[PDB]
Amino acid sequence: NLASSLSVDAPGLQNQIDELSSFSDAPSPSVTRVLYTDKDVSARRYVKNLMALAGLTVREDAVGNIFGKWDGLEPNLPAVATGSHIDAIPYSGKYDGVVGVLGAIEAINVLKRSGFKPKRSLEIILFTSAEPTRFGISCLGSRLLAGSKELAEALKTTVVDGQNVSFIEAARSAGYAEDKDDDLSSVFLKKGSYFAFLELHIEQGPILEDEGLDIGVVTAIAAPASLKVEFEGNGGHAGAVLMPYRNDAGLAAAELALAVEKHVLESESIDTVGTVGILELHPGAINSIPSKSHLEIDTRDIDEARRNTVIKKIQESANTIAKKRKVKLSEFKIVNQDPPALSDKLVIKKMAEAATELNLSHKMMISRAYHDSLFMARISPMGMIFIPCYKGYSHKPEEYSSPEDMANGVKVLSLTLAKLSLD
Amino acid sequence: NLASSLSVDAPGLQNQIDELSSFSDAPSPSVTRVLYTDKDVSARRYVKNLMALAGLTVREDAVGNIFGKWDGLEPNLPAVATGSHIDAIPYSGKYDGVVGVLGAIEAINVLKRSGFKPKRSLEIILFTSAEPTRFGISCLGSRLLAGSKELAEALKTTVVDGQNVSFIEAARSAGYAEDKDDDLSSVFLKKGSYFAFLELHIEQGPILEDEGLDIGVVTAIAAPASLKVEFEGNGGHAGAVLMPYRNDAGLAAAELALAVEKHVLESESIDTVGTVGILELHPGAINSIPSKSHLEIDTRDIDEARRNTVIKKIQESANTIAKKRKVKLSEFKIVNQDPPALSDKLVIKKMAEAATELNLSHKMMISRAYHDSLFMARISPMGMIFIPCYKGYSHKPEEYSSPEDMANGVKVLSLTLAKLSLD
Numbered sequence: 001n002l003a004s005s006l007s008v009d010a011p012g013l014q015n016q017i018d019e020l021s022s023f024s025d026a027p028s029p030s031v032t033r034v035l036y037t038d039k040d041v042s043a044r045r046y047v048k049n050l051m052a053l054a055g056l057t058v059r060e061d062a063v064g065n066i067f068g069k070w071d072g073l074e075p076n077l078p079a080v081a082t083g084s085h086i087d088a089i090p091y092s093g094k095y096d097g098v099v100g101v102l103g104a105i106e107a108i109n110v111l112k113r114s115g116f117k118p119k120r121s122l123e124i125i126l127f128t129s130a131e132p133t134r135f136g137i138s139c140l141g142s143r144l145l146a147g148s149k150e151l152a153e154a155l156k157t158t159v160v161d162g163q164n165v166s167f168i169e170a171a172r173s174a175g176y177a178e179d180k181d182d183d184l185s186s187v188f189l190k191k192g193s194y195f196a197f198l199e200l201h202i203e204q205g206p207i208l209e210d211e212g213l214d215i216g217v218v219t220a221i222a223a224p225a226s227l228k229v230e231f232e233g234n235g236g237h238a239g240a241v242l243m244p245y246r247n248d249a250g251l252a253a254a255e256l257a258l259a260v261e262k263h264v265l266e267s268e269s270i271d272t273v274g275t276v277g278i279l280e281l282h283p284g285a286i287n288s289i290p291s292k293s294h295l296e297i298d299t300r301d302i303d304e305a306r307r308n309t310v311i312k313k314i315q316e317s318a319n320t321i322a323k324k325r326k327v328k329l330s331e332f333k334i335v336n337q338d339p340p341a342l343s344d345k346l347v348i349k350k351m352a353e354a355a356t357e358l359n360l361s362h363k364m365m366i367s368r369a370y371h372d373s374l375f376m377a378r379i380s381p382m383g384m385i386f387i388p389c390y391k392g393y394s395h396k397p398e399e400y401s402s403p404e405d406m407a408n409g410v411k412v413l414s415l416t417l418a419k420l421s422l423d
Numbered sequence: 424n425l426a427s428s429l430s431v432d433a434p435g436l437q438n439q440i441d442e443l444s445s446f447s448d449a450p451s452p453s454v455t456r457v458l459y460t461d462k463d464v465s466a467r468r469y470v471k472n473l474m475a476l477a478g479l480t481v482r483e484d485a486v487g488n489i490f491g492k493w494d495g496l497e498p499n500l501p502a503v504a505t506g507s508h509i510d511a512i513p514y515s516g517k518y519d520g521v522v523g524v525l526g527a528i529e530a531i532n533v534l535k536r537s538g539f540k541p542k543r544s545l546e547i548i549l550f551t552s553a554e555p556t557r558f559g560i561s562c563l564g565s566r567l568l569a570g571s572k573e574l575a576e577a578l579k580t581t582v583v584d585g586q587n588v589s590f591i592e593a594a595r596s597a598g599y600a601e602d603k604d605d606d607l608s609s610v611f612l613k614k615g616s617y618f619a620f621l622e623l624h625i626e627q628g629p630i631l632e633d634e635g636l637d638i639g640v641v642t643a644i645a646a647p648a649s650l651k652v653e654f655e656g657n658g659g660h661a662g663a664v665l666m667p668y669r670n671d672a673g674l675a676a677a678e679l680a681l682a683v684e685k686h687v688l689e690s691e692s693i694d695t696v697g698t699v700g701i702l703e704l705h706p707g708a709i710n711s712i713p714s715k716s717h718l719e720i721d722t723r724d725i726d727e728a729r730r731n732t733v734i735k736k737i738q739e740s741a742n743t744i745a746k747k748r749k750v751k752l753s754e755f756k757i758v759n760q761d762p763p764a765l766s767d768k769l770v771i772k773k774m775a776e777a778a779t780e781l782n783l784s785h786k787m788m789i790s791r792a793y794h795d796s797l798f799m800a801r802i803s804p805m806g807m808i809f810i811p812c813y814k815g816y817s818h819k820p821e822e823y824s825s826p827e828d829m830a831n832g833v834k835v836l837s838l839t840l841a842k843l844s845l846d
């Protein structure tokens with residue numbers, strides 16, 4: 001049958017993972033690849049080349065989401081879509097996102113080798129960026145595909161990066177967004193434009209590895225939020241300003257970072273997380289008291305209400321700390337605060353069937369990380385396929401999934417796509 | 424008499440202050456001017472030109488200390504020296520250091536206008552740098568003049584900036600250190616090579632302003648120290664690594680910063696200060712748990728032993744925090760730990776006499792900030808003249824000393840130099 005005929009070039013897929021990892025602003029084994037930079041452009045070209053070699057119709061939208069389509073026997077039907085991202089936060093791994101892009105292309109080649117004849121078209125999506133590194137916005141591409149007018153407006157009017165480069169300027173430097181009449185609404189997909197959307201991704205947790213299982217069938221995605229906070233004080237000479245007269249913005253930040261941890265632990269649930277990944281002091285000189293501090297705070301929970309309580313407590317603590325330290329809470333911005341999503345029940349059903357037909361062990365599980373799937377779920381039925389990764393490591397160079405782990409995920413992806421195409 | 428004849432071009436001196444501030448990597452009204460950068464080179468040329476116009480014989484040493492001499496009637500005698508620095512930490516003011524260089528040149532012009540004829544030569548020193556911004560080393564020029572073989576060795580062998588540019592490489596780009604065969608010992612001055620050394624400087628405190636006084640006669644300089652600390656953890660995915668499994672290096676840093684403040688307050692003396700002016704996270708991404716954190720801590724006291732006690736407690740707290748957070752204390756380095764200096768009693772007497780002859784109110788007082796005078800005191804009898812500054816602001820763009828305050832300090836400098844020249 002189709003399932004027994006599926007054959008993946010495992011070392012070849014690994015070789016492509018390794019080649020793509022060379023497009024990096026960090027030295028191997030780390031990867032840094034930020035939206036619209038030269039490294040991102042190089043990686044885009046590499047992926048577009050592979051799409052063309054696999055015989056896909058390749059196109060790009062106004063923000064650089066990249067699409068590769070295999071036309072089905074009934075091309076007017078809503079297509080079955082799959083994809084992920086290739087951007088990489090500073091000093092991260094080679095597998096996050098990339099497995100779902102390179103592995104999707106491989107899934108197409110696997111199906112072509114087996115002589116599969118799609119009814120619904122299959123389309124691979126390289127999302128323009130999923131990481132919030134550059135503009136503080138996560139899933140920038142899929143948020144726009146899912147129709148966020150709020151985001152489109154901000155991208156056109158206010159959004160800049162940490163070097164004060166505007167989104168429009170960055171996009172144009174990489175060959176995109178060159179239309180002054182476009183408010184980016186051109187990117188929006190109609191609900192139902194896809195029959196379904198699947199994303200293959202490394203687990204970013206240790207569960208499949210620990211339990212000796214091949215495949216995770218993802219049933220839900222946890223609810224993510226991010227906050228941007230700034231404190232302002234008088235600053236001045238570290239040696240000359242006596243302690244009673246200070247309002248140290250650095251210490252306000254230190255206190256807020258510890259309060260974040262505290263409020264997370266207050267939830268009484270293991271599923272709650274919160275992190276201060278960014279804490280910067282200005283002017284940032286050893287002999288100058290910080291007059292401004294800037295924190296970027298990530299917090300999530302599978303339970304939206306519990307997550308929201310943490311955010312509310314964090315805001316209360318920021319105000320309490322500001323008053324006690326006699327600094328100004330000059331910014332408290334909820335950059336995003338998104339609900340969790342549920343995978344479509346019939347997509348889950350086909351994925352579990354596919355894994356079973358391939359003699360692969362599997363379990364139902366939730367994603368703790370967020371993914372483009374979170375926002376694609378607003379447009380169409382969604383599912384995710386997890387593969388194991390070593391010790392669950394991710395967002396760091398120790399991140400690892402074996403050639404066989406990837407090949408298994410690719411086979412499940414190929415077979416689920418085929419089932420959905422013929423449905 | 425000489426005292427009544429002294430007259431300063433106050434708006435002229437202000438114009439020079441403003442012009443020098445233009446040599447900055449930060450936009451007005453802030454100044455940034457770091458050792459050996461292009462802006463530093465431009466500012467050096469500007470000052471050397473003023474020295475030339477004032478009739479001074481100009482020379483430079485191996486590291487770019489700049490000397491301008493007015494030859495006395497007995498030129499073989501040890502000269503009376505005066506000067507300060509012109510480098511500026513990021514986003515600081517335009518009066519710190521600058522007043523003591525531009526004002527020293529103006530003191531020469533003032534004495535010349537009055538027909539004063541020095542017996543001992545007068546020599547103005549532009550110290551190559553006082554701020555520790557580039558290499559973590561404060562008073563680099565005066566530490567070498569005072570004969571630190573340890574510093575000379577490090578500068579030749581290990582010292583680099585945060586961009587891994589070596590001291591030698593940086594120095595050569597600015598036109599200095601062009602001798603392979605110099606161990607920098609050429610910079611060293613013999614004890615007694617100067618009869619006395621004076622530094623005019625803004626108070627960097629609010630005391631003279633609050634008390635309604637013209638001049639501070641500095642009696643001592645507080646004992647400064649600085650430390651570098653690093654913590655290391657495992658890092659990973661901020662959304663997926665559950666709280667019990669973390670060893671967050673950023674939270675370890677937050678805890679140490681608060682410990683610094685606590686230990687300072689434990690001294691029970693208002694003369695004790697401590698600051699965390701630098702706190703950096705790696706990788707520094709919102710969705711990446713910090714795996715490395717880096718703190719640079721400044722701590723001082725007029726009492727050396729009381730400060731050292733703070734330093735010991737900070738080291739103890741760093742170890743306790745590391746163990747509790749389950750991170751490695753990967754670095755704890757005392758970058759400098761220097762004793763206080765006492766101003767020379769005869770210099771103090773002459774300075775107070777000068778202020779009195781000029782009908783300027785004054786008090787004897789301690790300097791809380793450190794200065795090149797701290798190290799020149801090892802070579803020569805030392806004293807400092809403080810002028811008031813607005814609300815004591817320093818190391819920030821709000822720093823301000825009035826044209827009149829500066830002129831008063833220049834007159835006291837002129838008259839004190841004249842007294843010491845004619846001993």
Ligand SMILES: [Mn+2]
Pocket residue numbers: 096131395
């Ligand atoms: Mn990621």
Ligand SMILES: [Mn+2]
Pocket residue numbers: 085096097130201371
């Ligand atoms: Mn990802």
Ligand SMILES: [Mn+2]
Pocket residue numbers: 519554818
């Ligand atoms: Mn200073």
Ligand SMILES: [Mn+2]
Pocket residue numbers: 508519520553624794
């Ligand atoms: Mn200074």
